[PDB]
Structures are given as structure tokens and as C-alpha cells.
Symmetry: D2
């Protein structure tokens, strides 16, 4: 249980995160897809005192797709909630914005949804 740990999305991306007592999320992200190689830094925030009514724990984080190996001139933000359960999950929506010219800004942003569990897909 809990947010700190190693998680995988439905495509096998690897999300290694630590939830700090201060509400911080820190760790690394390794993408199964896209113009990405090896680990990237992530940082985010989570609600360190969630409701006690059965609701999930809100949270979000960012990866800018620049590391010491590659730069895709883009950033993904995941917004979602951790859900304790038989099999813990983090359910997210995300936005990926690329740097664009103004003329291309209308097509700057992809949207999708990732669900993370502590088990990796095959």
C-alpha cells in the first residue's frame, strides 16, 4: 500500500516515486513510448491528509522530457488520485505539451489517461 514505490502504467512505463511528509512527490520516470530514453526527473505534489470518507488521494506530477541523453522539447503532467484497494492503483489524466511556434500552438497538447499499478504489463 501507499504512494511511495515503483509503479507501472498500462504500457509498461516505470514510475519510481517517493511521497514526502511535506506533500512532495519526487522520483524518476522511464517511458515505454515516445522520444524518450532512460530515466527522467519528476516532481509533484500530493494531499498528505486525505479525506477519511473512502475517497482517493489527489496528486499530480510533471516530467519534462529532457535528460542528459535526449530532449523532446515537451512535458507531461499527470493529474489523478491514488486508490487504496485490493490492488492499489493511481488513476490519472495527463496533458503533454510540446514547445511549438505560435502558428502550431493549436496542436501543442496531447491528452490521455494512464492507470498505474505496482505490477508491470507483459
Amino acid at each position: 500500500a501507499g504512494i511511495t514505490g515503483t509503479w507501472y502504467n498500462q504500457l509498461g512505463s516505470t514510475f519510481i516515486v517517493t511521497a514526502g511528509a511535506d506533500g512532495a512527490l519526487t522520483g524518476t520516470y522511464e517511458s515505454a513510448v515516445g522520444n524518450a530514453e532512460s530515466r527522467y526527473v519528476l516532481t509533484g505534489r500530493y494531499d498528505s491528509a486525505p479525506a477519511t470518507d473512502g475517497s482517493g488521494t489527489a496528486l499530480g506530477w510533471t516530467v519534462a522530457w529532457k535528460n542528459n541523453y535526449r530532449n523532446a522539447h515537451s512535458a507531461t503532467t499527470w493529474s489523478g488520485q491514488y486508490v487504496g484497494g485490493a490492488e492499489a492503483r493511481i488513476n490519472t489524466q495527463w496533458l503533454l505539451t510540446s514547445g511549438t511556434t505560435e502558428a502550431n500552438a493549436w496542436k501543442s497538447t496531447l491528452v490521455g489517461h494512464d492507470t498505474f499499478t505496482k505490477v508491470k504489463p507483459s
Copy 2:
């Protein structure tokens, strides 16, 4: 210079003050136009510290969890966008606000919208 460090104001009464670190981090505060402590929240994010040189903007994103020492909305916003430099500098974003919900209410967990931030807002002498 990345052009990002400093104070920015969205179209609706919000402020944030951010530092863009040489290591690609965004760190700072997000608050109301009023600027009372109870309206202030931590943020953290990332930006591309080596943007393209073709006139494209600089990709970035950040998160605020809407809990501080005073209040807790059990929610978090992420802003994903790009900084556009020049005479009309902007940070153009789209955002996702997720609230903690039960599973039965998960369908209504996430709001979407857009924010444009600028370096100036209307201000007047007293």
C-alpha cells in the same frame, strides 16, 4: 536566460512566484491576488532548460496540491503548457484539477480548463 523566474498573473486573480533552476526544476508558490497566507500553496514542476532554437516555446508543467497549513480541498491541479518569450511574454497552459473521490464518483473527479499567465496585471494607486 529561460525568462521564467519571477511572478506571473493568470486571467482570474491568481499569482505565482516561481524559480526556474538550472537543473530544470520549477519551485515556488501559487496564491490569490489578495496574497494572504491562507491562499498560498506550494508548487513544484519541471521545464525544458534547453528549448529548441526554431522560435518554438519552452515546454513546462507544474502541480499544486490544494492543501496548506490552513485548508485542504483534497484536490490537485496540474498545469501543462509552454512559455512564449518576447514583447508579449506569456505562459499558455491547459490544466487538470483532480479531486479525491470514491470510485462511484470517479467519473466526476477531474475538471479541465486553460490559464494564460502574463508578467503584468492591472494595478492602480490607492
Copy 3:
């Protein structure tokens, strides 16, 4: 000829759609299974000449949540693609906008995703 017929999400909704040869989607969306006061018009468009390269068929539709019985003063649009074959799906992301005052416009629009199947759960 893949899309026409009955589709089911996880949440107890069902819709019936006709995919017309001119790109029209027309039908009825039932939000709750045993409830004839929960049926709403749906209307949209799809790519009537999709690729046959393994790609999905792009589509979208709208339901305004008003019928003769109920009115939520809101509308959902689903944007997605139909994936055919033996285990066909319509994979969507959606936007639900409610009418609001200007002061509340920042909180007017929910976003989410949903997957429909041909096989009644």
C-alpha cells in the same frame, strides 16, 4: 458496418447508433439500464472512409442531457475511435460542459475517458 448497433460502457450505460453512409451518427443513449426516463438523443459524425491499415475509425458524438423528463443543463461530447474485429471497442475521451454563470465558468467542464464494447457486460 462496424459501428452500427448497440454499445455498452462499465457503468451501466447503453447506446444504440446507426452509422450512416454519409458519416452521420444518430441514436439514443440510455444512462441507466432499467430506466426509460434516462434515454437521450445522440448525434455525431464519423469517418465514413477509414483506413484499412490497422488504425481505428475516428468518430465523435454529443448528448445534451435534456429529454422530456429531466434536464441536467449539460452536454457530453465523446471523441474517439472505433476498433473493429472480433473484440470491437469504441475508445473515447469525453468532455462534459455544464451551463454556468461566468463566475463559475472555471469549473464548467469535466474530462474523462470511457470504453464501449459490443458485448453486453
Copy 4:
């Protein structure tokens, strides 16, 4: 208030009719006005909005196929009409292109368009 010709911030031209029944029908085209740029739309709106100052919820779809071109994609706009002095339609949109399921993660763009009855600027 919805029936008419509307323009978004990039000059695209949205020629819509709002029918008695909640129906939206019309065309969507570029500022250039050429036939190859013009596409069919259909959608829905709340035909009985609240009377508390709230906007009128609506949505529509364009599949990006016409007699001339096919992009194997569709946009849905979800939003609300705000009447009064200067009428406006404020929207969020999703553009889905056909992909494989595996690349499905890059199928959908998101943005926002605001429409007025005047050309932008």
C-alpha cells in the same frame, strides 16, 4: 441565440442552426472559404437552459472527411453559449485521429476555442 455564423479566434467559420428539437446542424470551414476546407457538423444543445444567468450547454462534432480530403480524424467541441450584449460560445475540444491501439496514447489533441459573431480582431 445560437443559430448564426460564428468565428473562432483563428478565423474558422462555424455556420450553425439550432433546431427546435436540441439539434445542431451546419458546416465548419477555414477563413479562406474554399470548398475543400468545408465540413459537415452535427451536435446537440440544451433547448431549455436554466433561468439563473447560466449559459446554455452544447456540443458538436466534425469528422474531417469531405468530398475532397480525409484526415482520418474528428473534433468534438464541448461548451456553452453565453448570450447578451456580445454573444459568445466558449469551448474545450478534443481531436482524435485514427491510430493503432498501442499508439493510441498519441491519438488525441486537446484545446480551447472561443467563438463570436464577429471575426477575430
